[PDB]
Amino acid sequence: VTCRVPKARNPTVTYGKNQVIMLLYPDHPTLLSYRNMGEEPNYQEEWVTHKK
Amino acid sequence: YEHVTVIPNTVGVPYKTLVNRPGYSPMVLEMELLSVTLEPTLSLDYITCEYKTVIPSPYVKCCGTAECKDKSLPDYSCKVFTGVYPFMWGGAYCFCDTENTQLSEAHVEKSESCKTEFASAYRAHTASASAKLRVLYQGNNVTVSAYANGDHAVTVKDAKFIVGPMSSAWTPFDNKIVVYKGDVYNMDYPPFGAGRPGQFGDIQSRTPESEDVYANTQLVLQRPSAGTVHVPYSQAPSGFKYWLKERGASLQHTAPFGCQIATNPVRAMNCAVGNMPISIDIPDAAFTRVVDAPSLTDMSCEVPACTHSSDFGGVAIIKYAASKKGKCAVHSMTNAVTIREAEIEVEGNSQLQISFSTALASAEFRVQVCSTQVHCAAECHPPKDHIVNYPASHTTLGVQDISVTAMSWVQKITGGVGLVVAVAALILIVVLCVSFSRH
Ligand SMILES: *[C@@H]1O[C@H](CO[C@@H]2O[C@@H](C)[C@@H](O)[C@@H](O)[C@@H]2O)[C@@H](O[C@@H]2O[C@H](CO)[C@@H](O[C@@H]3O[C@H](CO)[C@@H](O)[C@H](O)[C@@H]3O)[C@H](O)[C@H]2NC(C)=O)[C@H](O)[C@H]1NC(C)=O
């Protein structure tokens, strides 16, 4: 069967030199993850439980 | 006419190739990859799922000793416990107090859930490539779905397009692949029959329907508590359940080159790796002779603005004198500068506008319109924006690709030092010549 899951609120995004700054507003613990799109993705992830 | 070109293996970025057949008006084709898929050949080694432990009602032999037989069941154990004095709700189970034995037995088998909840351990080999390509051919947008193994020609308005083989054999998938649902993992799973308790592969089966089950759960039967008939045991909890909690990120989130991962079938999509050759066969009927085509003369290029941003921030205005009204192909003569328009409509004595993108600090490039070339030059300025949501439409710069003033300063400094050396060298040579002249 198919389950319904929530979508976290859009982040507030500002930019710097080679930098993206996100302010996150989770209602409940939300997984954040990111990767480089090159040879070495340097994958990192963390759970966000509060505004960060 | 057979034309062979190569485009970078990127998605969402259009590339333009010039088809130059002398005596005929030039054609410019804009090709954009919309999707690139690599589908690995898979060979199932085994599957895993949660096991259930089956414990048949215990046999209590009153006033006598029970014995058990060996069984071939996947992970079977039997033990006879003496000195048992179990109670039922209405009182002691049987007549004898101490002369009683209980036979406990259990085996491990695949649960009913294994039909829905399971992971498949596959061996991955080579991958079949396929791609969806958008081609702008003679002003029309045609999307073709074709294989990218170099063995499939797909027709676009009577032109044949052969795609591939891809120049890179790289795949996000390792030799050992484990698939749960929509998630694919590069896990080095144990060989069938070599599983370990509490770990992935503790229970293994060759196929979902197979009755042949391997199990290593360390199922140990324990003595029942006094006065009871229950059958206690110590067993390593399913490694499948542990794995599900400890899965970590799937390849969809960890793969290099921004690869997207999907299952059913297993696919790696839109990997930004290497490049992809395209061979185009265009029939003579598709070519217009230069005598019938529009021809431009007295052309002059001026660039009122230039920004070296990822988008088409540059604009160039080119004056032209057209021999007749009609559409005309536009091509950039340098890799450093990407022109957005593939074709323009021209007539009479007027000017045309084209947009371009370059990483160059100083944009020096030539533009070919209806086989007539012009020279464009501009001083480009940097963008104020730091981040965008789209890839650059232009190529990267080489070490030689520097601004005009930077080159001038380099020549002045290099020449300055070179002059000092040349003078010092001349003085030394003259002095040595005098020294050699003298005896
Ligand atoms: C050939 O196709 C390209 C690319 O568009 C493709 O075909 C379209 C019919 C759609 O199916 C697209 O999803 C698909 O990718 C055409 O170029 C694109 O044209 C559209 C307008 O039709 C542009 O969208 C506009 O963008 C501006 C700026 O953001 C907005 O203000 C507008 O409101 C509108 O959204 C799009 O950006 C442009 N893309 C590129 C790379 O240029 C092309 O015109 C078409 N040619 C022909 C003859 O059909």
UniProtKB/TrEMBL annotation, chain A:
<comment type="subunit">
    <text>Homodimer. Homomultimer. Interacts with host karyopherin KPNA4; this interaction allows the nuclear import of the viral capsid protein. Interacts with spike glycoprotein E2. Interacts with host IRAK1; the interaction leads to inhibition of IRAK1-dependent signaling.</text>
</comment>
<comment type="subunit">
    <text>The precursor of protein E3/E2 and E1 form a heterodimer shortly after synthesis.</text>
</comment>
<protein>
    <recommendedName>
        <fullName>Structural polyprotein</fullName>
    </recommendedName>
</protein>
<comment type="function">
    <text>Acts as a viroporin that participates in virus glycoprotein processing and transport to the plasma membrane, cell permeabilization and budding of viral particles. Disrupts the calcium homeostasis of the cell, probably at the endoplasmic reticulum level. This leads to cytoplasmic calcium elevation. Because of its lipophilic properties, the 6K protein is postulated to influence the selection of lipids that interact with the transmembrane domains of the glycoproteins, which, in turn, affects the deformability of the bilayer required for the extreme curvature that occurs as budding proceeds.</text>
</comment>
<comment type="function">
    <text>Provides the signal sequence for the translocation of the precursor of protein E3/E2 to the host endoplasmic reticulum. Furin-cleaved E3 remains associated with spike glycoprotein E1 and mediates pH protection of the latter during the transport via the secretory pathway. After virion release from the host cell, the assembly protein E3 is gradually released in the extracellular space.</text>
</comment>
UniProtKB/TrEMBL annotation, chain B:
<comment type="subunit">
    <text>Interacts with spike glycoprotein E1. Processing of the precursor of protein E3/E2 into E2 and E3 results in a heterodimer of the spike glycoproteins E2 and E1. Spike at virion surface are constituted of a trimer of E2-E1 heterodimers. Interacts with 6K protein. Interacts with host MXRA8; this interaction mediates virus entry. The interaction involves 2 adjacent E2-E1 heterodimers.</text>
</comment>
<comment type="subunit">
    <text>Oligomer. Interacts with spike glycoprotein E1. Interacts with spike glycoprotein E2.</text>
</comment>
<comment type="function">
    <text>Acts as a viroporin that participates in virus glycoprotein processing and transport to the plasma membrane, cell permeabilization and budding of viral particles. Disrupts the calcium homeostasis of the cell, probably at the endoplasmic reticulum level. This leads to cytoplasmic calcium elevation. Because of its lipophilic properties, the 6K protein is postulated to influence the selection of lipids that interact with the transmembrane domains of the glycoproteins, which, in turn, affects the deformability of the bilayer required for the extreme curvature that occurs as budding proceeds.</text>
</comment>
<protein>
    <recommendedName>
        <fullName>Structural polyprotein</fullName>
    </recommendedName>
</protein>
<comment type="function">
    <text>Provides the signal sequence for the translocation of the precursor of protein E3/E2 to the host endoplasmic reticulum. Furin-cleaved E3 remains associated with spike glycoprotein E1 and mediates pH protection of the latter during the transport via the secretory pathway. After virion release from the host cell, the assembly protein E3 is gradually released in the extracellular space.</text>
</comment>
<feature type="transmembrane region" description="Helical">
    <location>
        <begin position="417"/>
        <end position="437"/>
    </location>
</feature>
